[PDB]
Amino acid sequence: SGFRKMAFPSGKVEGCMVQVTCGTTTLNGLWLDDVVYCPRHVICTSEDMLNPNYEDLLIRKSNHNFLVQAGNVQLRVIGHSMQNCVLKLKVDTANPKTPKYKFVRIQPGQTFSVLACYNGSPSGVYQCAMRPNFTIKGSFLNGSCGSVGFNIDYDCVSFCYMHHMELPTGVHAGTDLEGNFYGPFVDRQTAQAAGTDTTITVNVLAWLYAAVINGDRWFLNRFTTTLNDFNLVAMKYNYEPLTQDHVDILGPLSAQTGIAVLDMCASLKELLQNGMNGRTILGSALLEDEFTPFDVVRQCSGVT
Amino acid sequence: SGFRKMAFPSGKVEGCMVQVTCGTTTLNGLWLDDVVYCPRHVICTSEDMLNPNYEDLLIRKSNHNFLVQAGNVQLRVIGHSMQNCVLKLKVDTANPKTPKYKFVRIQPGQTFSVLACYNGSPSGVYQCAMRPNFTIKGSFLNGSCGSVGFNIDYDCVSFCYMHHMELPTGVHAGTDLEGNFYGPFVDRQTAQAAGTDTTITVNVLAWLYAAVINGDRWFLNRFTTTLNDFNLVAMKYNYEPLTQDHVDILGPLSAQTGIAVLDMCASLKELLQNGMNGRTILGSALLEDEFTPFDVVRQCSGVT
Ligand SMILES: O=C(Cc1cccc(Cl)c1)Nn1nnc2ccccc21
């Protein structure tokens, strides 16, 4: 028993972290096979960041301007290209520590581990969710750009995020590994609106199921509800509408606890309308939404 | 900016995890140099667990009964000994992935990362604290015994915990790497009292400093207090007494924020006496105590 914000073991990803430098700028890169991936803003100076023409800036750069260092070894850059907001630096040596990997564009509401890095060196690992408004609430300092988010399935690392920027609002934004930003963000120093975020309803239900599995059952009531009645409450409290697809994803948790999804919804409705009354659920005094139903099943079944 | 429960990069420890089997029982072991460390209850059957005489049970076991497997390779056991509550299995092969390491007995209130494992395979990593009552609030399932807790300093892994058991109360208990239990716990299937836990005051103050560094300042008031007046409030709310040593450990955070420690205490006193009024601090609706002042400095400075 017990329920924590658990991240994936980071070893497979730590062996991929490199340092990329272009002139004055130093950030993290991801070395997979003979390609080093990093945010394209590595080629900018602070003056360029206000409104960069990346095609023009990249043209004034040659292979020898990109310093790629893997620990102590300097990698030789034999090619460079821009794919959307990432730079792809072809190097002459394949990473001997390249694990089985995939590049995936995660859906909003899904979770992933972040390996925060500085100067190509890992500092820490934490679990977070892609918010419905395509931002992430991570922990990043200057130098962290190029740190990646990933999931692990058996021995396959699915890279899903690369960190690009922190907006003046404190939100964190970045791209998939093909350089496409999640959300409406652009890699330029301009004020950017993130847009209204919502609570991931299916994730809060999954966490309520984790609470039931872990002995916290105070919030369980003698009531039930319908999807339409529940969604009226969800709309009022800026929660995502619960669909039959979400009910189906919750199936394993419903089967494990013997508590119908709509009965769990009724508990959530009373929790939204009355609050927690100063009580806690899994050590928290607020409804947690950064655990997917898969995260709960994995944590409560022991998937290695 | 941003503040998360960050764990250490786990790679160095993942390369040490092995599977130890003795008859029916399979748990995790830690392979460092030519020694595999694991909980001694690996030699027990369910009947033995009620009241085991470990010396007697270990006598009916020979080197060939301990099956140590590192991934796919079977390790050859050339020696066995019991050191307190751990079994030390001498093997004929030194772990080629042994990092620079130390065995340390952590103090209550300190934090460490846990790499949860099943069958010698890592599943996840999370940060937790050694509670003042020497229990940990982790996330463990059956098979997790032998999973370790550690801290990393530059390239040196300081192993501080090995998981042994979950008590009927849901608490998690274990030993340092010399087999000495943290707390009053014994490795036998008997009901055991954990004893009253307290909130780690110096950790809550460190987290209040993290909140100030990260823009959450609503809780800052026009008041100050003394150590004696604050400790009267701490005693009432089952908080550890704050000492001048704790004030000194908070020095870097006081210098970084320009907020005197006793001024931060006054905010904490009003927070304890009035609650949060439904508001949040760093995404939490309760006072967090599982971040040390060192954790805050590290997370807010980028120590890799
Ligand atoms: O924000 C930037 C640089 C930047 C500026 C303007 C546009 C772009 Cl694409 C990138 N770096 N980052 N990323 N996370 C950070 C956390 C703290 C301090 C700096 C941080």
Ligand SMILES: O=C(Cc1cccc(Cl)c1)Nn1nnc2ccccc21
């Ligand atoms: O508690 C035991 C076995 C045991 C029983 C009696 C005494 C001793 Cl020393 C050890 N294993 N563990 N450890 N964490 C667990 C979480 C869930 C299920 C089982 C778990």
